[PDB]
Design a protein around this ligand. Structure first.
Ligand SMILES: Cc1cc2c(cc1C)N(C(=O)Cc1ccccc1)c1c([nH]c(=O)[nH]c1=O)N2C[C@H](O)[C@H](O)[C@H](O)COP(=O)(O)O
Ligand SMILES: Cc1cc2c(cc1C)N(C(=O)Cc1ccccc1)c1c([nH]c(=O)[nH]c1=O)N2C[C@H](O)[C@H](O)[C@H](O)COP(=O)(O)O
Ligand SMILES: Cc1cc2c(cc1C)N(C(=O)Cc1ccccc1)c1c([nH]c(=O)[nH]c1=O)N2C[C@H](O)[C@H](O)[C@H](O)COP(=O)(O)O
Ligand SMILES: Cc1cc2c(cc1C)N(C(=O)Cc1ccccc1)c1c([nH]c(=O)[nH]c1=O)N2C[C@H](O)[C@H](O)[C@H](O)COP(=O)(O)O
Ligand SMILES: [Mg+2]
Ligand SMILES: [Mg+2]
Ligand SMILES: [Mg+2]
Ligand SMILES: [Mg+2]
Lengths: 332, 332, 332, 332
């Protein structure tokens, strides 16, 4: 049995080759932002409410048209065949069965149409290409295959400095490819995407308050407050530390998701209490995939669902909206 | 000789089976709140007063009708026969002899009437039952047996995630039972209890300021500001960190107790200086019981009494009321 | 050569019996205040001034009538024959030769008249006795022997809980006695002392702002902001953390000294910059005495004098008054 | 390959004699300020901007008349033949080739005319001499040799207490000399220098806001906010912690540089975001010189240039001016 997400990290470290575990675990530079994502969540304490009706605790949310079983989606993580032979199909099947949205990557190692054919709630994560037209073509491919939202990742004009990868001499195995086959994206790219599709466009990698405001003005349906899991700018603030200010600035004008460092249902509760609509979870999903394939991811999502229900009810929240109204206190 | 409560922890760790020591010591989840209870007290420094009359330093208080020898009571801890064969009777006898209130548990391993027959100042701690009527029946049983206050624990709609217990496969030995034999309690349950008894109702597990205010409005005679020793919501704020704000909000409308992490008479002084009427002490009482039964608990209460007197007088306080008027400073 | 006061601590630990080193080093309780005295100084950073005239840097001050070579005096430390056979005479001779005031203890292991006969600038530290009349008699004895100030220690209604001493079973060797041969002192005792002598009365152990104000109103010539080296109330705030608020409240109405944790000339500079008139130094003087007797104390005072001159000049201060006008910043 | 500046520190520790590595690495006193320079940078997080045009990211700045390839110069470090036989010539050649200003030291181990003959952008760092006239003569020598700015170091009325050097018995080898061959400098010295040369005078070692303002009033063309790498006053605030307040006080009246602890291009970005015109880098340049002479310094400057470009672009900054408008957040 796994009783925490940390149990899955230990299992994945046992099974994966060291250089693949380091590609997964590592951040850029000194890994200051990778560590700070965890420090920031550990400093947040919740002030629970008592004596409220918990007859029907529900962890469901509605987001981008549709019901999700938890306030969580699987983050976009490139090249999932690095971690298990079934790669993205194993994760997308488990996400579908758990009622959790799965984000299909531009750099997926199985084609986006095959993963979308699994069913469930697929979103599609876009990187802008130097060849523009390939960008809007991926978007249209995703929409034609049934993806529900376009998650436009905006924090990768190029890959950050991954010193573990450099020191390991890491490269993709011959058997892992970009099965769908960086330019800096700008606000003009966002408008090109928004014009090309009626799906909600979600800008992922926003940390500045004024960029969140501009995203609403630009017609985004959501943002993901994120420093890319500490893998891009080393020293970028954690998303969790900007979330409350961004939620206030947005005034309900779009959905505000957060990612980076979510390692338990209690962390999901903290993100909700700071105002997030939902969270993304990246590395833990890959730990479960590495450890035990589709069944591993299933067990992870079952464990997270139980932890979120436990934390919500112990905090007096019968719904995710109630959890958003909880207050927090920073500790040491 | 034990010269600190930490000496008793070391003695109990020697004698108890590991899985029982872990049931006692552990918290929920990552044990963030278990640790934070201690961190929070360690950050509080007292500003002592000098040159005041200390001719007659007294640690006594009046609470819920009656005199207590110290501003402290034994917290409700279920199943005390886990720790020593005499269980609750050993602890209740030592508490009586020390002039300290003892809280009889709904989940006591000796019946509440037997423990109440020990004498002293017994309080009774209630859990709300799915069978309501059993709830009001326990209350009436407690009142009929001479209990002085009903401590209604409101932070357990269900048991939190005790990972030590899960990993140890912990269960009650066959020889430990609930000798008096969870539903979520609500404010309606509180009113049902308040209507059923003329004893003071004390709501235990309050952390939000508005819940403390509502408790006064609901007719509570006291509250215990508490995160259940870090055993329920992992990431719940320590009670000590909410205490000052709650004492201000209550405006003397009820007694305000605190628990979590009290490990010395100096910690009692800090809680008093932050405004507590009294503290509860949980794990250290069980350490003394495990180490040396009734005589162990007696020695613990003698040591705590000496530490409280020492700290009060060194801080210039001839009474607990004077200690409540001390100022504090947070450190690092 | 000793190049820091920490070199002397290491030397004293080598030479002294463990239980005597623990009597010297230890604090009360968990030693929270003993540690916090050091933490508090380590958090203070100085903002130095540049490009000022340093032609004649002087570390001298005038205090309680007389010139001192440094803004420092030897703290009162009982029973100095515990540390070296010459005890107080060795320390008082070195202090005299360095131009530093030496505080003669009520509990000195050489009589106050013998130590005063060494010469120099002796102050006398008073404990109030249950036999009052013995108190005013010690004061008159000190004045008759040439002491310049009465340092009335007010934070010892009784000795704090010294767990090292308890665990070691520590007691005075037969060869160490109180050669001049606790009741709680009150403000009435202060007035009795102030009436009995024309010497300045300095109240040692003040931490609350209103007690500092009351000391000025009571006719004190000085106060020592102090938690008794962390040896009395465990959890008492460090004096360094109250110093700035106290200096502001006093408005120049008396001298404001500080002690606790001074381990370098840079620490003296920090205390001055926070507003202290001078500091006391306790344990390091005993380390030097243990290590090398009178010559050890001489070397310590020479090293401290050089460190204070170095720090003052590097901070742009040609006088201690200039150092008091420096600004500080708290760090981590 | 070196992939971080920390790789070069490890290489230099391998090659240099321990006492020379300690002369380079060490600070004064307890090395509180040496450590705090690093702590202060590690607490700064950047809030990056997204979706801006990065077609032409440039790290160039204009400073003191001339273009520099990065917002950085080589700090003045005395006696560089301690670290490699080619000493200052190796470093100045690599700096020239990288388009980075090199600061020639008053205490250089190769004469200032020889180093200036390397070409590039040489600045000259002045110490004030007890023989004044030698001071203005060095200035005129530097100007005659083509130096572009006079960096007047004002924080060394004498050398701080270098306990590593004392404990190692460190002295200059016979083969290292002051090839150009302390008095306290004052504002009058600054005016003497400003009158003697039309080059910009840059005062290095300013930490107080009012000294920065006075520097502008005195006609300085720049200041370096600096605690001398933690080598002078132990307990002096880090320059990075004063930088923002100083930049605000100066109101664009002079260039404001900072040094101390810069160990990556991300640290350069943080200093820029706090308002620095440019940084100086000291110890890492000497690590590269020790490790591999001129080619080592070349590799260091190439690595720093790539790290600055990476950090700027990941933070959405196409120019150093844009990076100065970034906001920051302090973390833990
Ligand atoms: C752990 C991991 C995270 C990510 C990726 C891969 C790995 C192993 N991807 C890439 O390598 C993309 C790339 C970038 C540069 C060069 C080649 C490929 C990836 C990505 N985000 C995204 O939009 N698309 C991606 O394709 N990320 C961030 C992820 O979406 C979340 O932001 C964090 O994982 C939340 O933090 P976590 O829960 O603490 O892990
Ligand atoms: C250490 C311990 C504490 C408690 C318990 C047992 C143990 C070993 N109890 C239960 O397992 C109840 C239960 C819950 C879920 C499933 C079965 C039983 C218990 C309880 N509080 C309460 O109302 N009634 C209880 O019956 N608590 C908290 C206690 O009252 C104090 O809140 C903290 O002990 C102060 O923190 P401490 O001084 O640092 O320890
Ligand atoms: C380290 C030490 C300090 C002190 C003492 C002895 C020792 C070894 N004395 C006693 O045992 C008095 C006593 C108390 C209770 C029972 C018997 C004797 C002593 C004293 N202060 C004072 O008025 N008179 C004293 O007779 N102190 C505090 C001292 O004056 C300074 O407050 C701190 O030493 C600054 O902190 P430091 O620089 O970090 O050490
Ligand atoms: C690491 C080092 C730094 C410096 C020096 C030598 C060493 C090995 N110099 C001296 O020994 C001068 C001296 C002083 C007293 C007695 C004899 C000689 C030196 C200097 N600054 C300056 O104006 N001129 C100098 O001649 N410094 C500071 C340097 O300019 C930077 O302020 C810090 O190096 C940024 O911090 P860093 O990037 O973390 O290293
Ligand atoms: Mg996450
Ligand atoms: Mg407690
Ligand atoms: Mg001291
Ligand atoms: Mg630097």
């Amino acid at each position: 049995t796994y009783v925490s997400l940390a149990d899955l990290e230990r299992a994945a470290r046992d099974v994966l080759p060291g250089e693949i575990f380091d590609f997964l675990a590592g951040g850029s530079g000194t890994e200051a932002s990778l560590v700070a994502n965890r420090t920031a969540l550990e400093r947040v304490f919740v002030i629970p409410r008592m004596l409220r009706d918990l007859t029907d605790v529900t962890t469901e949310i509605d987001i981008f048209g549709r019901r999700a079983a938890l306030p969580m989606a699987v983050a976009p993580v490139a090249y999932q065949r690095l971690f298990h032979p079934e790669g993205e199909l194993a994760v997308a099947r488990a996400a579908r069965d758990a009622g959790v949205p799965y984000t299909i990557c531009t750099l997926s190692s199985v084609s986006l149409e095959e993963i979308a054919a699994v069913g469930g709630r697929p979103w599609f994560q876009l990187f802008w290409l130097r060849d523009e037209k390939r960008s809007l073509d991926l978007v249209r491919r995703a929409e034609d295959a049934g993806c529900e939202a376009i998650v436009f990742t905006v924090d990768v004009p190029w890959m950050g400095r991954r010193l573990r990868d450099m020191r390991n001499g890491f490269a993709l195995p011959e058997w892992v490819t970009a099965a769908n086959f960086f330019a800096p994206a700008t606000w003009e790219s966002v408008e090109a995407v928004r014009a090309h599709t009626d799906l909600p466009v979600v800008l992922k990698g926003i940390l500045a308050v004024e960029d969140a405001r501009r995203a609403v003005d630009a017609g985004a349906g959501g943002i993901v407050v994120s420093n890319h899991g500490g893998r891009q700018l080393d020293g970028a603030v954690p998303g969790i530390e900007m979330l409350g200010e961004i939620v206030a600035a947005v005034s309900g004008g779009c959905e505000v998701l957060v990612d980076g460092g979510i390692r338990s249902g209690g962390d999901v509760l903290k993100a909700t209490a700071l105002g997030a609509s939902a969270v993304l979870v990246g590395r833990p999903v890959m730990w479960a995939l590495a450890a035990a394939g589709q069944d591993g991811v299933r067990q992870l999502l079952e464990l997270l669902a139980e932890e979120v229900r436990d934390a919500m009810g112990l905090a007096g929240c019968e719904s995710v909206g109630a959890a958003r109204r909880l207050n927090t206190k920073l500790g040491v």
